Write a protein that binds this ligand. Sequence first.
Ligand SMILES: NC(=O)c1ccc[n+]([C@@H]2O[C@H](COP(=O)([O-])OP(=O)(O)OC[C@H]3O[C@@H](n4cnc5c(N)ncnc54)[C@H](OP(=O)(O)O)[C@@H]3O)[C@@H](O)[C@H]2O)c1
Length: 430
Amino acid sequence: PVEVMAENARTGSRQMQALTPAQRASAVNTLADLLVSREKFILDANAKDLAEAQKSGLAKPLLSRLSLNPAKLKNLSVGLKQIAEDSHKNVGRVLRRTRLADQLELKQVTVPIGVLLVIFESRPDSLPQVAALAMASANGLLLKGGKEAAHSNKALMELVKEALATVGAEHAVSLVSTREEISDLLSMENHIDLIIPRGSSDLVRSIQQQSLHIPVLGHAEGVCHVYIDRDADLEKALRIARDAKCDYPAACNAMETLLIHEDLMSGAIFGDVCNMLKREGVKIYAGPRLNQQLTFGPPAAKSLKHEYGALECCIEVVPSLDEAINHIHTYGSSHTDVIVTENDAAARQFLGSVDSACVFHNASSRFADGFRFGLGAEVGISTARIHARGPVGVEGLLTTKWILEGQDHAAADFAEGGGRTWLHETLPLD
Ligand SMILES: NC(=O)c1ccc[n+]([C@@H]2O[C@H](COP(=O)([O-])OP(=O)(O)OC[C@H]3O[C@@H](n4cnc5c(N)ncnc54)[C@H](OP(=O)(O)O)[C@@H]3O)[C@@H](O)[C@H]2O)c1
């Protein structure tokens, strides 16, 4: 039903709130180890899932993204191991700590957020990550996955609950039914704390319309960008384009725009660019500047913003770095932006100039999924300007509290006739 889930979440919050790290650490340890042994189960489950998906036949890249292979499995295992290793100081670690007056202390401890309602596209590999995140931050979690991996989702939840069997708190993680339950649950506020819809434009809007006294954070858009200039190895440019647009064609952070310094169009590098783009079979487009530049050129574009989410692209030429920054800040979505150059001056210039959630010099637009940032398992990427930037790791799921204990103080003791005066020194935290 509806409020039974809410009360189970509150019970999990109360339990994990009084569960010392000794419990949850071993909990995610067993989660990993059990994900290693019984993986054949979830393997065949996701096999059936992708089989029935292909039988339905939505779209080949989507079939690739909802797929699953032992490689990602071992990667998730070692990532959760890293989390468990470095999660002993999540809830309870002090951030600030001072001493205002004589015999009066003030600190700022971390604190669980409570109940989160995460929504996310099929992406069956995420469920273990997000569940490990909740179990490691000791906050109630509700789930909702795409109907595609439904069986795989249920299997993974069987896994995480057989893991929870060692701690007894069998409620902090749950599943839900179709979006009707999601609506009626988002309605019953005063029991939820955040909503993390991992990728939905219209559904970001819908949650907003249904966000009655409840915050929202996630990512609704991901238009990345790349750039090259007169001081970059052609080979590095080629292979970076390859890595960027040919690992997960349409996951979250695949670039869909190229930018070139006009003094490199004569260098025929555009030729090899299209050569490799066609060796991978990608229908490049172009916009105003290039579409004028060439004899008659590849076909025209519509809007430099439209995300395509498949083996497509767009190429424009820019007169100068200034135009590059203007173009990025005016068309991008501050998701993840790259460059390639040898002149370190232009490098730091572009780094400090652009504003995106990620900036990269001589690297790939693919390095943004938290895991490859050594952050361990994560929930998504944040485009917004509050509470996080980029991969929302653990620390993106924790807020602060001001506990303040004294002997006998008051407000007037600091007035004109008071007997104690401020110090405002920051003692070394424990
Ligand atoms: N930035 C990128 O590179 C990139 C790439 C691919 C996808 N994405 C994001 O992922 C989305 C793709 O669609 P999706 O089906 O895969 O999203 P989803 O995570 O599967 O969410 C379920 C879908 O049901 C629909 N709906 C109506 N009411 C809903 C409710 N209360 N709760 C949940 N869903 C409700 C939503 O819109 P629909 O009916 O239209 O699905 C929603 O997309 C896109 O909107 C996009 O934001 C981003």
